[PDB]
Write an enzyme that holds these catalytic residues in place. Structure first.
Site, PDB file in Angstrom:
ATOM      1  N   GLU A 205      41.615  62.038  71.006  1.00 38.42           N
ATOM      2  CA  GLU A 205      41.076  61.362  72.185  1.00 38.42           C
ATOM      3  C   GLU A 205      40.797  59.875  71.924  1.00 38.42           C
ATOM      4  O   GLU A 205      39.648  59.435  72.014  1.00 38.42           O
ATOM      5  CB  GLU A 205      39.825  62.069  72.692  1.00 38.42           C
ATOM      6  CG  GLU A 205      40.037  63.540  72.998  1.00 38.42           C
ATOM      7  CD  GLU A 205      38.892  64.151  73.782  1.00 38.42           C
ATOM      8  OE1 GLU A 205      37.822  63.515  73.876  1.00 38.42           O
ATOM      9  OE2 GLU A 205      39.067  65.271  74.305  1.00 38.42           O
ATOM     10  N   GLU A 386      42.351  71.352  73.197  1.00 34.35           N
ATOM     11  CA  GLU A 386      40.938  71.531  73.506  1.00 34.35           C
ATOM     12  C   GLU A 386      40.788  72.026  74.935  1.00 34.35           C
ATOM     13  O   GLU A 386      41.458  71.533  75.847  1.00 34.35           O
ATOM     14  CB  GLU A 386      40.137  70.237  73.330  1.00 34.35           C
ATOM     15  CG  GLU A 386      39.605  70.003  71.928  1.00 34.35           C
ATOM     16  CD  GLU A 386      38.726  68.772  71.839  1.00 34.35           C
ATOM     17  OE1 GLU A 386      38.002  68.485  72.816  1.00 34.35           O
ATOM     18  OE2 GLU A 386      38.762  68.088  70.794  1.00 34.35           O
TER      19      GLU A 386
END
Length: 482
Positions: A205, A386
Site C-alpha cells: 500500500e 488483504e
C-alpha cells in the site's frame, strides 16, 4: 468446488503489526517512535497503545502457522522489517546509481556489495526470518515476501527530529537517498531469503503513504509518488539480478465511485490519480513528469515513457476493504462522508449498509469492480492480498468473508485472473494509529497471555478452503451485505 484447484487460501502479516510482544523488541522504526510520540499521544493522533505489547509473532510463529494449517490455509504473505535487518545505515556501501537528470534510471548491486551488506546487517534478524520462512516451507506454504510495509529505519526517517510547526507528518516517504538504500535492502533480502520464498512484493500500500502530507498540492502528490515508482522499479531490478522469481506490488484499492453513478468521467479521473497513474508507470513504463507543473495545476504531463520503468511488474496484490464516493470541486474532487471509509459516526451508511468497527462501510461489490478494472487494463496475475473487517465479537465477519469470496468467484468467471485470497489478520494485531482495539483477526488475541482464540469465522474459512469455494449451504451468510 467453484474456485479453481490450487486456489490459494491464506493470511497476510505485517512485521511491525504482529512481531513484538515477548522477545525481539525493535525500537529502530519510525513508526515505533510515531506511536511513542508525546505530541501524538496528547493530541489523539495515535492511540497510546504500544507496538511492543503485541501479538508476539516473533516467538509464536510456529504456533500460528500450525493454526493456519488447521483452518485450511496453504499460503501466506509475510512482511519483513527494514529496521530489523539493517538497524544501522548502509550508506557506507557504495553502489552504482545511474541518473538521467532527476530520474533514477538504474542501481547495480554486485556480489561483493552483498557481502559488505551482510557484514553490517543484523544476522539475528536474518536467521529468525529464515526460521519463520523455513517453518512455512515445512508446512507447504506458498510464501509471498513483502519487503516494505510503511515503517522505515530511524536512520532513513526519524520523526523525533521533526518539528510540529511545519505540519505533524510521519514523513515515511521516499527520496533519492531512500531509493538507493532501498535497492540495497531489496537486493540483500533476495540474497538472504530467495531459496525460501515463492514470489516478491516490493511494498505494501504505497498509496496510503504518498497520498498524505501533501497539503492538498497535486504537484507534491505526483512528485512524491514518482520516488515510490522508482523505489519499486529499482527494487525490482536488484531482485531480478539475484532471483528468477516473480516480483510485484501490493496496492490499496479503495473502490472509487460517484453518487448514484452520476459522474463517470470524474471516476475515471480519480481512479487514474489514485491507482492507474502508479501501476501504469511500473507495468508499461508510461509514467508522468512534474517538471512543467505549476504549484496550483491539477494534472501531470502525461505520456512520459521511461524504458527503465517498463515491464517491472509481474503480478498485482489487491487489497480491498470498502468504497470511496467522490464529487466534483473547483480544485478537483472531494470524498463524501456517509459512504465507504468515512462512516465513523455512522450507524448505517447513507446507502443503508452495515458499518464496521473501524467506521468502514461493508461493500463487497467494490472488490469485483476493482478486480475487473485491474484485469481489463493489465491482464496480469492477481492475488487478493488483504481483505478483512474489525469485528471483535465476530458478528459480521462470517458474512463479510462469504460475500467478498462470492465477488472473487464472479470476477474469475468474468475473466479476472485471481490466484488466491489472503484474509487480513490471522490474529488480532496492532492497527497503526488505532492501536490494539481494532480486531481484524480470524483469531482473537489476549495481549496479556498472548493466547489465541478461535472465532467462528476461522471455521467458516476452513470450510471455504475445504470446498475450494463457497458451498451453497454457506451462501446465506453474505446476503446481508450485497
Amino acid at each position: 468446488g467453484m474456485l479453481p484447484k490450487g486456489f490459494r487460501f491464506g493470511f497476510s502479516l505485517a512485521g511491525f503489526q504482529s512481531e513484538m510482544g515477548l522477545s525481539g523488541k525493535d525500537e529502530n522504526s519510525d513508526w515505533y517512535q510515531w506511536c511513542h510520540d508525546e505530541y501524538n499521544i496528547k493530541n489523539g493522533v495515535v492511540s497510546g497503545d504500544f507496538p511492543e505489547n503485541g501479538a508476539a509473532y516473533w516467538d509464536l510463529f510456529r504456533k500460528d502457522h500450525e493454526t493456519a494449517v488447521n483452518i485450511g490455509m496453504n499460503s501466506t504473505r509475510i512482511g519483513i522489517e527494514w529496521s530489523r535487518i539493517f538497524p544501522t545505515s548502509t550508506e557506507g556501501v557504495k553502489v552504482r546509481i545511474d541518473r538521467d537528470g532527476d530520474n533514477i534510471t538504474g542501481i547495480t548491486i554486485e556480489k561483493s556489495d552483498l557481502e559488505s551488506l551482510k557484514k553490517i546487517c543484523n544476522m539475528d534478524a536474518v536467521k529468525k526470518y529464515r526460521e519463520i520462512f523455513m517453518d512455512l516451507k515445512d508446512r507447504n506454504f506458498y510464501m509471498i515476501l513483502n519487503l516494505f510495509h510503511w515503517s522505515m529505519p530511524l536512520w532513513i526517517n526519524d520523526p523525533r527530529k521533526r518539528e510540529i510547526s511545519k505540519g505533524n507528518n510521519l514523513g515515511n516517504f521516499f527520496s533519492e537517498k531512500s531509493v538507493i538504500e532501498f535497492a540495497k535492502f531489496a537486493a540483500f533480502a533476495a540474497y538472504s531469503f530467495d531459496d525460501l520464498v515463492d514470489v516478491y512484493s516490493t511494498m505494501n500500500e504505497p498509496n496510503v503513504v504518498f497520498s498524505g502530507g501533501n497539503n492538498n498540492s497535486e504537484k507534491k502528490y505526483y512528485s512524491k509518488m514518482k520516488f515510490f515508482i522508482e523505489a519499486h522499479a529499482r527494487a525490482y531490478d536488484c531482485i531480478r539480478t539475484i532471483s528468477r522469481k516473480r516480483i510485484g506490488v501490493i496496492y490499496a484499492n479503495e473502490h472509487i465511485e460517484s453518487l448514484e453513478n452520476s459522474d463517470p468521467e470524474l471516476v475515471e479521473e480519480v481512479t487514474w490519480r489514485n491507482r492507474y497513474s502508479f501501476i501504469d508507470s511500473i507495468k508499461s513504463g508510461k509514467t508522468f513528469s512534474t517538471k512543467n507543473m505549476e504549484e496550483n495545476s491539477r494534472w501531470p504531463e502525461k505520456n512520459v515513457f521511461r524504458k527503465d520503468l517498463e515491464n517491472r511488474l509481474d503480478w498485482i496484490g489487491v487489497n480491498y476493504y470498502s468504497r470511496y464516493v467522490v464529487r466534483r470541486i473547483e480544485s478537483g474532487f472531494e470524498a463524501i462522508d456517509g459512504y465507504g471509509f468515512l462512516c465513523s459516526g455512522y450507524e448505517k451508511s447513507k446507502d443503508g449498509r452495515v458499518v464496521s468497527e473501524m467506521g468502514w462501510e461493508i461493500y463487497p461489490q467494490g472488490l469485483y469492480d476493482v478486480l475487473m478494472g485491474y484485469q481489463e487494463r493489465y491482464s496480469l496475475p492477481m492475488m487478493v492480498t488483504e481483505n478483512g473487517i474489525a469485528d471483535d465479537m465476530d458478528r459480521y465477519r462470517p458474512g463479510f468473508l462469504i460475500s467478498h469470496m462470492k465477488m472473487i468467484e464472479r470476477a474469475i468467471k468474468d475473466g479476472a485472473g485471481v490466484e488466491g485470497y489472503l484474509h487480513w489478520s490471522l490474529t488480532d494485531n496492532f492497527e497503526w494509529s488505532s492501536g490494539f482495539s481494532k480486531k481484524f483477526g480470524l483469531l482473537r488475541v489476549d495481549y496479556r497471555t498472548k493466547k489465541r482464540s478461535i472465532r467462528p469465522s476461522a471455521l467458516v474459512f476452513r470450510e471455504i478452503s475445504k470446498k475450494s469455494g463457497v458451498p451453497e449451504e454457506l451462501e446465506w451468510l453474505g446476503e446481508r451485505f450485497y
